[PDB]
Design an enzyme around this catalytic site. Structure first.
Site, PDB file in Angstrom:
ATOM      1  N   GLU A   1       0.773  -1.234   0.000  1.00  0.00           N
ATOM      2  CA  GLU A   1       0.000   0.000   0.000  1.00  0.00           C
ATOM      3  C   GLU A   1       0.810   1.293   0.000  1.00  0.00           C
ATOM      4  OE1 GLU A   1      -2.421  -1.319   3.492  1.00  0.00           O
ATOM      5  OE2 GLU A   1      -4.014  -1.590   2.005  1.00  0.00           O
TER       6      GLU A   1
ATOM      7  N   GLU B   1      -4.123 -10.451  -0.462  1.00  0.00           N
ATOM      8  CA  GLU B   1      -5.022 -10.340   0.693  1.00  0.00           C
ATOM      9  C   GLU B   1      -6.471 -10.591   0.271  1.00  0.00           C
ATOM     10  OE1 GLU B   1      -4.515  -6.630   2.936  1.00  0.00           O
ATOM     11  OE2 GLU B   1      -2.393  -6.632   2.345  1.00  0.00           O
TER      12      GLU B   1
HETATM   13  C1  LIG Z   1      -9.665   0.576   6.212  1.00  0.00           C
HETATM   14  C2  LIG Z   1      -9.661   0.178   4.736  1.00  0.00           C
HETATM   15  C3  LIG Z   1     -10.282   1.302   3.898  1.00  0.00           C
HETATM   16  S1  LIG Z   1      -7.970  -0.159   4.124  1.00  0.00           S
HETATM   17  C4  LIG Z   1      -7.760  -1.890   4.614  1.00  0.00           C
HETATM   18  O1  LIG Z   1      -7.840  -2.006   6.069  1.00  0.00           O
HETATM   19  C5  LIG Z   1      -7.675  -3.382   6.511  1.00  0.00           C
HETATM   20  C6  LIG Z   1      -7.797  -3.437   8.046  1.00  0.00           C
HETATM   21  O2  LIG Z   1      -7.572  -4.766   8.517  1.00  0.00           O
HETATM   22  C7  LIG Z   1      -6.288  -3.947   6.062  1.00  0.00           C
HETATM   23  O3  LIG Z   1      -5.206  -3.237   6.681  1.00  0.00           O
HETATM   24  C8  LIG Z   1      -6.204  -3.855   4.528  1.00  0.00           C
HETATM   25  O4  LIG Z   1      -4.945  -4.331   4.060  1.00  0.00           O
HETATM   26  C9  LIG Z   1      -6.398  -2.402   4.110  1.00  0.00           C
HETATM   27  O5  LIG Z   1      -6.341  -2.300   2.686  1.00  0.00           O
HETATM   28 MG   LIG Z   2      -2.126  -0.181   5.068  1.00  0.00          MG
END
Ligand SMILES: CC(C)S[C@@H]1O[C@H](CO)[C@H](O)[C@H](O)[C@H]1O
Ligand SMILES: [Mg+2]
Ligand SMILES: CC(C)S[C@@H]1O[C@H](CO)[C@H](O)[C@H](O)[C@H]1O
Ligand SMILES: [Mg+2]
Ligand SMILES: [Mg+2]
Ligand SMILES: [Mg+2]
Ligand SMILES: [Mg+2]
Ligand SMILES: [Mg+2]
Ligand code: NA
Ligand code: NA
Ligand code: NA
Ligand code: NA
Ligand code: NA
Ligand code: NA
Ligand code: NA
Lengths: 1011, 204, 193
Positions: free
Chosen positions: B51, B127
């Protein structure tokens, strides 16, 4: 912190790189590119003090002027002011190879300047200082306070001085280090110098400012429509009323305009750039940019408020052109290019590496006048003005990163090391950020001679990613690695392979078709022009023209890197490696240009101009076929002049206007050419003239020429037998032949014509003898040295074979009386310690007409290295002012470098028959000569020759031209045969086989007579 | 094995990764990882990070790896999961049949993603199946697709263990805490718990 | 130099990265992957003191132990020891987004260790120290002399201590900064420690 010994630190507090700024506050000034009050120059007189090391610099210097200091001009290289010596080394680093460390004795230049700053500059906005070039690293102080640090000697370093300045008087302190960890990436083959060698200036920008802007141009299939895309970035506070307007101009006409508030399109899950905006303008039937027609538009970027109030404006010249590689060919605006390029270092014999507009313009004019359309920035980003001149005059440019680690072992030791990726990346990325808007730049280069490392692959991909409009090339590691879009070898030969392990240099014709290879091939370096060189140049161009994927190359190189020194009387002379006490050094290897340091042309320049001609010709009967190699322009400033002469005597001539479409052909029918009465060879000579002056040439400029032998009438008529009969007087030691007022003397012990008389006057100072050697050229010598002999170099083979020591042993010498002439017959054996190298058999026939016919037949032992020449030589007592000859001229020309020379009647002052190469050697030869005239003498036949006041022996024993002394009389060398000069490279034998004197047996004949 | 590089909170996400000034810091996070772990057989794929949008620095480092270690594919999800910086289409939370046409960075149905005009790479979700609390509904739909489509070669569930921390009350009794329970603010509360098992490894 | 606010400086005097080393002086030991006499662990009880910022760290801390310091186990996160709070944020950075700057109030962990070194280790060869993971940046001193600096919380930082050690007792001083320019590259969705 010793930041200059840490590749991890390449700068401290330095501002981001960007395209040329001026911060105009008037849009009209921006459009017309007029000076800007917001961009001030700090060039001029500065205070300077030299120190052996930074540890020796006194702390007081930071606060006030050192009384020990001198006042010097800036920009400048301190070696050019005599503070220390400039060093000339090619490959070997000038310092011990122990990265990232440099010598503790590190020459330090302490520059300082006391200048005024008006309060208005400090009340608002940002005041930055710009150092376009500091070699090689430096620390900056302003009014005693440390500001920052910077590396990379060839790109500008900018620092914000807004919080350091005060209204009124201010003092800058710049500590420049000669050596730094950056020096490991600056091992280019040139003089090693240092100092503040490029412009220094102050730029004022508003707090809310244009921080960057990129211009791109895309086209439809036939380039009849284009879209100009301009991305603009700002810094400062964002306000909804802020606006950006991009306008495009053709002369004083606005062809398009676009306005918009900041805020880019969404790029990812987090949104987009709120501090950027992209304007897109449509352009119908854009006038395209090319080196042929440098059409330019003006793009103006205005930062302003919605209500129309201007905040600031920037701008650049825009050249509408598309560069792309398709199906294995490098295309420009859809057409396959033919690169007539040259490598050009930034060098001045007086100012070192400081560049000025006048010298730049002179180089560009000479380049275009000699049919070059491209230049490679070997091997670092150039002074900013250079690209502006190339955009406007029209030259294709290869912008190269300041990265060369040639001296490392192996060559890629640093470039394949991730710890050096950061340092290397800044040298590539900051270059792109600075020059990406220049249309003249059509290809990016990752640097030079640094092997091939993973860092190169990474940086190659970085450029492809940020700027897809330009191909990326890099020669290191084999010239065809995964880090290059173009096969770009240096010194690869045309037909001959050089199978070096790991990094072979294949014949260029063969390279293109290797299994799986599909890329275009353009030599980044070829035809090494060291001294008397460029032999075989035509072979490259014949190949470039026959093979579509062979798209040319860049000659090495433009100008000799010689420096000026003065003798006791203040007379200037050209100096090279080692003349400044610099050691170790690589002597004359710094001089490989087509022109001398003062831009005077070397003979080779004309051979390049001819081979690079833009019009090709063919002849069939009375028809001349003219083919155009231009891609975009019609021949609207060309006139073809033709001439037919019999042995230099003009019979007919005329002119025809050329009207050829690019890539097209035109047939010109010659009028009935009246047959000459007298015997001889008729020659057709055509030349293309440009009636009108251009931005780069004067009216009457000759751009191309060519010759063809027409009919020839063999002379059969017998000479009216003269009543006079020569007489022979024989003695124990001589054979003397008297004929009226003339006398010939043949020493019976040596077997040579030792003297001649015309009245009571002696004509010779030295006997007429055979000669099989020549004062070695740069190409004959290669890298051979007294301390390091290269047994393979031509000069060394000749030396070891005893060619220069050979003694003539008389085998026969007789005299016979004919009914109307005297016949002398001789035979000599040239041996070297029991080994017979050559055998010369001659006959001298003197008739009543006073003419002496000489026949020479030579045998050359097959197992001795092929001789440099096969001819005769003598020192004439006479010293005349002119030299008249019917042959190839007017300029110096050799067997493998004579295509540019034309056959005709030439007449020049004796001084022009000598070429002043800084490093003396055989020179001034003229080939294909049928008649030679000097003083009362005349020689006829079919020979090559050079004539001057310098003997081959002196030229061979003298290291510098200024040390040459005119000898008594005139030395004449007349050759039946002369070896090629070579030049594909200058460190290994390069004379092609067809130009080596390997026939074993040779024959030539000469007729010597008094006019 | 993945580089320690995530700049999720930047606006836009690639503000640093597309800035050459940050290339040096990023390259070291990638190169030193490769120099440390390249001899481990278990590592079969290199990842440029997570990210951080898609920037030119990613293309540079992607090529660096391919150059120094051709024995392992290189993947990266940023900028749309199918950029020039990845050998594998590796989206996060792309659904089986439902497209989510977000601007610039859409998450197409994984079955559809595979056959987009010109696409030929394999698709493995970096993921998927966010296991926050009572979750994993629809998990079987993913595996049915993985088994039917050769190029849908699986994915990595998000994630293994709840990131809950232990705190103590009056009676000294320990309890599982999440975002905000330490006075930390601002915080993202229970979003730190998305595992298949509790922090003490007891299965969900 | 505030090296923790400069993405241009990610380390100082750090040794090159490489695969796991143990420097066995016995081949069979290497073959069987048994412990190496040349690879020692410094894990265990260290001395620790918390400060609100690097400017609050007393210079005396470089020369000798701070009596106010506590004895704690290492490796460890100091939030788990209660010195300050662990922060859980997903996307939004835990510090103001103003690259490459970090808050002036930068929790600083001062670690120190008095340890012994066999003389044979100093009579020849090179003795290096390896920190497998320090979050998020730090400066290192040995016997009061500055050794180096390092960033990237998830990879080992190694330094040559050969010229800083003496036979017998030695004292390491490690100043760990919670926030650094490296933090802009470590915004993973997890507790910030
Ligand atoms: C909060 C979302 C818009 S982003 C989302 O949050 C998740 C929380 O477990 C993970 O961190 C994912 O990898 C992330 O893309
Ligand atoms: Mg993140
Ligand atoms: C000396 C050769 C082995 S290397 C050779 O030297 C030349 C000197 O003009 C140029 O610098 C070439 O670029 C270089 O490759
Ligand atoms: Mg440095
Ligand atoms: Mg070189
Ligand atoms: Mg001017
Ligand atoms: Mg010709
Ligand atoms: Mg830092
Ligand atoms: Na291209
Ligand atoms: Na060609
Ligand atoms: Na040279
Ligand atoms: Na014309
Ligand atoms: Na000489
Ligand atoms: Na599958
Ligand atoms: Na989470």
């Amino acid at each position: 912190r010793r930041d200059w010994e840490n590749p991890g630190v390449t700068q401290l507090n330095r501002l981001a790189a960007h395209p040329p700024f001026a911060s105009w506050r008037n849009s009209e000034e921006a459009r017309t590119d007029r000076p800007s009050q917001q961009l001030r120059s700090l060039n001029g007189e500065w205070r300077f003090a030299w120190f052996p090391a930074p540890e020796a610099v006194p702390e007081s210097w930071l606060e006030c002027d050192l009384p020990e200091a001198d006042t010097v001009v800036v920009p400048s290289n301190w070696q050019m002011h005599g503070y220390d010596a400039p060093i000339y080394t090619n490959v070997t680093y000038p310092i011990t190879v122990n990265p990232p460390f440099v010598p503790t004795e590190n020459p330090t230049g302490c520059y300082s300047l006391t200048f005024n700053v008006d309060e208005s500059w400090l009340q608002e906005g940002q005041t930055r200082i710009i150092f376009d070039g500091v070699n090689s690293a430096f620390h900056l102080w302003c009014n005693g306070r440390w500001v920052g640090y910077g590396q990379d000697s060839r790109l500008p370093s900018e620092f914000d001085l807004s919080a350091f300045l005060r209204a009124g008087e201010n003092r800058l302190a710049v500590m420049v280090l000669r050596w730094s960890d950056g020096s490991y990436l600056e091992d280019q083959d040139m003089w090693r110098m240092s100092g503040i060698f490029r412009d220094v200036s102050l730029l004022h920008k508003p707090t809310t400012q244009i921080s960057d802007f990129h211009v791109a141009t895309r086209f439809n299939d036939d380039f009849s429509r284009a879209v100009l895309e301009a991305e603009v970035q700002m810094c400062g506070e964002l306000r909804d009323y802020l606006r950006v307007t991009v306008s495009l101009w053709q002369g004083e006409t606005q062809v398009a305009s676009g306005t918009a508030p900041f805020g880019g399109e969404i790029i990812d899950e987090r949104g987009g750039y709120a501090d950027r905006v992209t304007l897109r303008l449509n352009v119908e039937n854009p006038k395209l940019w090319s080196a042929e027609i440098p059409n330019l538009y003006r793009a103006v970027v205005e930062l302003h408020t919605a209500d129309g109030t201007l905040i600031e404006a920037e701008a650049c010249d825009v050249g509408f052109r598309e560069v792309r590689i398709e199906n294995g060919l490098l295309l420009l605006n859809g057409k396959p290019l033919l690169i007539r390029g040259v490598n050009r270092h930034e060098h001045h014999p007086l100012h070192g590496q400081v560049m000025d507009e006048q010298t730049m313009v002179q180089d560009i004019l000479l380049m275009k006048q000699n049919n070059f359309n491209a230049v490679r920035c070997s091997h670092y980003p150039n002074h900013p003005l250079w690209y502006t001149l190339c955009d406007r005059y029209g030259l294709y440019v290869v912008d190269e990163a300041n990265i060369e680690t040639h001296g490392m072992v192996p060559m890629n030791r640093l470039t394949d090391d991730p710890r050096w990726l950061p340092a290397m990346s800044e040298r590539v990325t900051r270059m792109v950020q600075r020059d990406r808007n220049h249309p003249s730049v059509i290809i990016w280069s990752l640097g030079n001679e640094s092997g091939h490392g993973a860092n190169h692959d990474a940086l190659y991909r970085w450029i492809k990613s940020v700027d897809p409009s330009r191909p990326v090339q890099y020669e290191g590691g084999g010239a065809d690695t995964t880090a290059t879009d173009i096969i770009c070898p240096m010194y690869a030969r045309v037909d001959e392979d050089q199978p070096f392990p790991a990094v072979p240099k294949w014949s260029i014709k063969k390279w293109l078709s290797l299994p799986g290879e599909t890329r275009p091939l353009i030599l980044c370096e070829y035809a090494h022009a060291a001294g008397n060189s460029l032999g075989g140049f035509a072979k490259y161009w014949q190949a470039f023209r026959q093979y579509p994927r062979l798209q040319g190359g860049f000659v090495w190189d433009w100008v000799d890197q010689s420096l000026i020194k003065y003798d006791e009387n203040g007379n200037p002379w050209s100096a090279y490696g080692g003349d400044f006490g610099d050691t170790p050094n690589d002597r004359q290897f710094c001089m490989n240009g087509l022109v001398f340091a003062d831009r005077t042309p070397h003979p080779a320049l004309t051979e390049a101009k001819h081979q690079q001609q833009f019009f090709q010709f063919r002849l069939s009967g009375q028809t001349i076929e003219v083919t155009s190699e231009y891609l975009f322009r019609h021949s609207d400033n060309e006139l073809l002049h033709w001439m037919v002469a019999l042995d230099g005597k003009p019979l007919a001539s005329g002119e025809v206007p050329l009207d050829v479409a690019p890539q097209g052909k035109q047939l010109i029918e010659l009028p009935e050419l009246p047959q000459p009465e007298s015997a001889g060879q008729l020659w057709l000579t055509v030349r293309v003239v440009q009636p009108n002056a251009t931005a780069w040439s004067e009216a009457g400029h000759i751009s191309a020429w060519q010759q063809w032998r027409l009919a020839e009438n063999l002379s059969v008529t017998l000479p009216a037998a003269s009543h006079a009969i020569p007489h022979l007087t024989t003695s124990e030691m001589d054979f003397c032949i008297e004929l009226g007022n003339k006398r010939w003397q043949f020493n019976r012990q040596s077997g040579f014509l030792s003297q001649m008389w015309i009245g009571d006057k002696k004509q010779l100072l030295t006997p007429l003898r055979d000669q099989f050697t020549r004062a070695p050229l740069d190409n004959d010598i290669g890298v051979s040295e007294a301390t390091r002999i290269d047994p393979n170099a031509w000069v060394e083979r000749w030396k070891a074979a005893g060619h220069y020591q050979a003694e003539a042993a008389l085998l026969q010498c007789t005299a016979d009386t004919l009914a109307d002439a005297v016949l002398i017959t001789t035979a000599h054996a040239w041996q070297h310690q029991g080994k017979t190298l050559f055998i010369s058999r001659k006959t001298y026939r003197i008739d009543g007409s006073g003419q002496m016919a000489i026949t020479v037949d030579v045998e050359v032992a097959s197992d001795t290295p092929h001789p440099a020449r096969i001819g005769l030589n003598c020192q004439l007592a006479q010293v005349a002012e002119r030299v008249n000859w019917l042959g190839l001229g007017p300029q110096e020309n050799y067997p493998d470098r004579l295509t540019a020379a034309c056959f005709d009647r030439w007449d020049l002052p004796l001084s022009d028959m000598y070429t002043p190469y800084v490093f003396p050697s055989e020179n001034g030869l003229r080939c294909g000569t049928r008649e030679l005239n000097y003083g009362p003498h005349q020689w006829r036949g079919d020979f090559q020759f050079n004539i001057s006041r310098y003997s081959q022996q002196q030229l061979m024993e003298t290291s510098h031209r200024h040390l040459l002394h005119a000898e008594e009389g005139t030395w004449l060398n007349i050759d039946g045969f002369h070896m090629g000069i070579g030049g594909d490279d200058s460190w290994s034998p390069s004379v092609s086989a067809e130009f080596q004197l390997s026939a074993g047996r040779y024959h030539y004949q000469l007729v010597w007579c008094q006019k």
